[PDB]
Symmetry: D2
Subunit: 296 residues, 4 copies
């Protein structure tokens, strides 16, 4: 009930250590990240009982300026020798608590800024550019970390989660929504073949926090692989609801990644309307949503 910090701390770096040696799965071609260009948007929040008088009295003696937190994060991207956004948050968190002993808790959110490769031609041969990248406004990897300083001054991870945000998938056929309650408030017709359009935010938790850092990359779960599981499962099965779809996606994730403990879904329904006069159009604003956890 007393925290402060900095949001929208963007930091971009070239030639981060490549992520290599990740275990591949049948649903995904993902085998690593070259890391020629790496971007992250970090939010940092900190607290501690010794900050009380910064609120109650206007005493700034123990206030790390939020501007300085921004400098801390950006400088640490330059010195980070690891390979994942999760490991970067861990580096920032441990470093920050080691620097500022009066801080008792730090919470970090990191959002990948995704870039995609582009094509260039050199002497007749077209290939991926190592220089020119396309900024993507589509799905992106996320990471969350909370760390605390205990009364015996050890540091402990109290929460850690990885994710995939902003995935927007439409399946043109092979989706039903039937059998729901029909009463005085029901106008929705039964539909045995709708073009289901779902937004997915998927988060996962590791059994062992160390697996999230890429130290042993064979145990890392890449957001890219989660994406490709999601599209494969959506494709493979006649859907009966978004609820049951996210259940089946979660089951496949836990099957493919036994090192995970849980998968959490936040989904939204944005399915198009058939037009007034198959052609579809955008619906009115109200959107359905679902929240669901699958456990290993």
């Amino acid at each position: 009930v007393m925290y402060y910090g900095k949001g929208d701390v963007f930091a971009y770096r070239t030639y981060l250590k490549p992520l290599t040696g990740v275990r591949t799965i049948p649903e995904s071609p993902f085998s690593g990240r070259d890391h020629i260009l790496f971007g992250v948007n970090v939010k940092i929040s900190v607290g501690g009982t010794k900050l009380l008088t910064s609120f109650t009295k206007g005493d700034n003696s123990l206030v790390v300026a939020t501007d300085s937190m921004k400098n801390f994060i950006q400088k640490h991207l330059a010195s980070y020798t690891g390979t994942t956004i999760e490991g970067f948050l861990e580096y920032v968190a441990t470093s920050f608590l080691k620097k500022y002993s009066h801080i008792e808790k730090i919470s970090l959110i990191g959002e990948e800024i995704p870039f995609e490769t582009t094509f260039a031609v050199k002497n007749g041969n077209r290939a991926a550019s190592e220089l020119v990248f396309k900024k993507s406004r589509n799905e992106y990897a996320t990471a969350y970390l909370n760390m605390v300083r205990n009364e015996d001054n050890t540091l402990n991870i109290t929460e850690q989660q990885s994710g995939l945000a902003g995935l927007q998938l439409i399946k043109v056929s092979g989706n039903s929504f039937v059998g729901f309650i029909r009463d005085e408030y029901t106008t929705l017709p039964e539909d045995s073949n709708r073009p289901l359009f779902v937004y997915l935010n998927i988060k996962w938790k590791y059994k062992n926090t160390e697996d999230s850092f890429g130290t042993n990359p064979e145990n890392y779960v890449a957001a890219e692989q989660i994406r490709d599981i999601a599209t494969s499962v959506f494709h493979e099965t006649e859907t009966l609801s978004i609820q049951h779809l996210i259940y089946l996606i979660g089951r496949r994730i836990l099957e493919r990644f036994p090192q995970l403990q849980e998968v959490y879904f936040e989904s939204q329904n944005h399915t198009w309307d058939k037009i007034v006069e198959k052609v579809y159009t955008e619906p009115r604003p109200p959107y359905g949503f679902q929240c669901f956890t699958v456990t290993q």
Copy 2:
């Protein structure tokens, strides 16, 4: 966990029962709401153990369609005879749990869609129009309500909060930020006179949930009044930090409204840079603060 529902359920109606008989405070001229035009954006979430098979098996037998929740909310705005957004959420929640016995929990968020009065001339007389309103994209009232059906089938409120969101205040002078840690990570200069620009989201919790509904309107705490306390407190004193500003705003709120238990702040710093005096927009990173003031903080 397992929940599902509908967001962005907009509903507009004219001639909601007016809010009057409120209790005034020195910081605010607020005296009620005409309610000629009323709008709300509702989010509804529901849960219950009996919904498991809708996820695990694709059995929709016990699923209230989210489209039907949308219909339920919109129709109930037509039949609501009360005077506040908080009371509207209570009416929706109680009505919904009574209709659907297999639902164990409902969670509602309501955001006011604010409209402002405009001028019209009628027969040489300029006055506020009863017909034409301006849609506002500035601050707005909010309300939060969670309700449960207990195992013994009684219904109980499990969370209730009211709020003010989207308030953006700049104070051109009379703000200092000095005395903070200056170390190897510090490039921020001391500034004894900055144009502090804060975004405020303020939420309050009543001691007695009935006071939020408007039934006895003298016990209601209006978002307009909270707004006016925030602006007066910001004006009245030299600020030393956003942290300490929100503490003083919270203390004044709890002093003016003894029926409140606590008040929660989420603030953001958006202060302008001096240009490379004239000011300009900063880079994207923004400071923020989260703080709860309780009755234990009172004089």
Copy 3:
């Protein structure tokens, strides 16, 4: 062939106040305190001598766009006038005088509006001179283009003022009937709809000097235009947005004979009645498609 800088924000305190304005029945507007002033400027420049900056990569005659930003921001500090229109003229004249190889400059200025707030001082509640609320609602605009002619004289080549971002809903007293009903028509006749319009209004002065504030009795304030729009919308049963904006434009030109013409860009965002059968009507947000209208009213319409 043009280049420039957008989103050049500049804020200052205690700009010279705007006073001495001429009033109209529809509006209480009496001036602007200018305790807090903000503007968002876009600048675009051109000139034949800039060709090789494109064709060859030669930057020798390029004013960096960063330097344009510095120019604008510094000139808000030295501006001694009272309107956004005048500020643009000051920037444009100053810029072309500084950079003789630039043949054309185009400026857009958007007001960043702030609203007064209440404070209690010693038991007296009054408007604060210190704390303001940033507004995301309607705002004044200004457009100015200037050229350096072949003979080195400077001339304004376009000037318009405006009001943007006005969103008005009239809950009753609106009809839309009599339109074409054919095989593409699913819209019912509606003799009483809650018409919701977005308005962007621009006006052109007969005499460009009247826009600058030098003789402030000839200035047309966006606040006054706003208040004409709300009054006219209230006063009469609307028959369409088309005819509403015609009537607003006629009133503007009648109230401000120093204006040559007024231009409207309107959009229809009227709510739908809710799907559920219903006590009074309830409305909700429509699907995304929006109607729009563009219309110019001139003195020939009076």
Copy 4:
């Protein structure tokens, strides 16, 4: 000075006729569009002297409701038998002017709603799905058409343009910006190696309007191909300014597509700042953004 219409007319259709047989170029693998899923956002504007009294008098007798324009567009996506967004706009325009004789002008803008393929597994083999697509918020194709009814009742295309919007490209090295004017207003340091970040909107006009419709797909210029030219040209050379980059992109486009008359660019500069406080680290700049407008002809 008198128009009205409808914006944000979204229409989505499955199994539009595929676009096949497009001439390839070295910079791009593009050969066509499966059109399993097709989406467009249309804006329609119409005008005509016979609409005057709808404004001056409130007489709606000759008003096609904007709602009905929306119906017209959406129904015509169902009946369109062609293969390009440009051809769809031509179909809508000709059909609309043929239906409503009192309309003298129609202007259409179409924005592709882009969808990307996704992976699915069958029998352990991973391949692109024919059912599941990913909605993209990145670059997209555009088309513009203005058509008028002449006094002799012939219909005439008065403006026609195709485009690519929303392309955001960053080149990490191999970019300079030096030699610009340094005077009392200049604080920007010269930079011989910046990570240039450009937004590109690219439009092109055909020599012969018929080439935009896909009827002979060998003459069609796909926005995908323009995208890939842009990234190749950006890669290939040390840039000296955005101005000179868009010039070189335009020259390459006109070389690869001799059926084009002109290329028009609207570019923006969003290059990151080096941080205040090992390799370099960058961050987001303040809001002011540079921009350029430029036309290449031939």
